[PDB]
Amino acid sequence: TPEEKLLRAIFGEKASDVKDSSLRVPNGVSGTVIDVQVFTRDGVEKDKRA
């Protein structure tokens, strides 16, 4: 919208290529992470945590 054109011209802050789909804790559940499991395909370079 023209408003965000003007505002992003004012602040510069041109919006990046990447968004945000991070998995977060569902609201009002709260506890301790006791285990994590990672699954990667056969060919993709693995995560450091994996």
Binding site: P2, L6, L7, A9, I10, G43
Partner: protein
């Protein structure tokens, strides 16, 4: 009485007499000449063959009647391109055309999202290869195992297997219980939120108020150039041409107006900074 489409059609085909070789040849000479009657009689006499073949190719592609019609279309191509002079029987030739046409039809129509023939046939070779692999490995094959067999890219194999992902109906009720379907859960992601709609009102209206704080000249330059209070995002030349010739002066007043807004923001920006989430 007897109201099945299928039964009616099969009865009608039954009442046409089967041809011998010499008869087919005589008829067909005149059919290529354009006898009309000859073509009709050869078609109708050989409909029963179509049904025998469509019986085989059916199974899971399409409705039997659907297969029969496509098969008939193949048979017509065969009657148009038959060679009576060549000693080969008609039924032998027709079988090729009928099978061909049915298969091509089921490669297109069967898939909701129409898949081009090339993609479909590629995918099929991936499948048949998977079958051989699975027989001998005891295990159904991975994408990369199939790819290693073909000596090809895993990305290729993966993309094809993704396309094979078959559809789920939005109306299918969930959980073995005729309670509620997928539609009942599925959001409109594009449609925000009375929240979001009201926030745009608030945003747009706060910008009006902010624009009026500035000079009459700056505000008008900003409004016309942004296309905010104007209609069209008037270019430098357009805004200058309507006000002050100096195209350069539009840039100057515009950039000046942005910097006065920055001042308002450093002072009263305590509201503006919260627009960042």
């Amino acid at each position: 009485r007897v109201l099945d489409a299928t039964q009616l059609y099969l009865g009608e085909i039954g009442y046409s007499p089967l041809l011998t070789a010499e008869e087919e040849v005589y008829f067909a000479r005149r059919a290529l000449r354009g006898d009309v009657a000859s073509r009709r009689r050869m078609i109708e006499s050989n409909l029963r063959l179509v049904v025998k073949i469509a019986r085989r190719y059916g199974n899971r592609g399409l409705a039997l009647l659907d297969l029969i019609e496509e098969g008939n279309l193949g048979l017509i191509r065969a009657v148009e391109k038959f060679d009576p002079e060549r000693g080969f029987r008609f039924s032998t030739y027709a079988t090729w055309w009928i099978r061909q046409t049915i298969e091509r039809a089921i490669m297109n129509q069967t898939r909701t999202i129409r898949l081009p023939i090339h993609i479909v046939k590629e995918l099929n070779v991936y499948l048949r290869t998977a079958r051989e692999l699975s027989h001998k490995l005891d295990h159904e094959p991975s994408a990369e195992e199939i790819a290693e067999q073909l000596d090809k890219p895993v990305d290729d194999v993966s993309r094809m297997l993704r396309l094979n992902e078959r559809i789920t109906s939005v109306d299918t009720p969930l959980g073995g219980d005729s309670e509620k379907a997928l539609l009942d859960i599925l959001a409109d992601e594009k449609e925000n939120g009375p929240e979001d709609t009201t926030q745009d009102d608030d945003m747009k209206q706060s910008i009006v108020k902010w624009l009026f704080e500035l000079n009459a000249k700056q505000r008008e330059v900003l409004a016309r150039r942004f296309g905010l209070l104007g209609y069209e995002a008037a270019t430098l030349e357009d805004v200058g041409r309507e006000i002050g010739l100096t195209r350069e002066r539009v840039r100057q007043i515009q950039v000046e107006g942005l910097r006065r807004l920055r001042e308002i923001l450093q002072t009263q920006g305590l509201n503006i900074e919260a627009l960042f989430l």
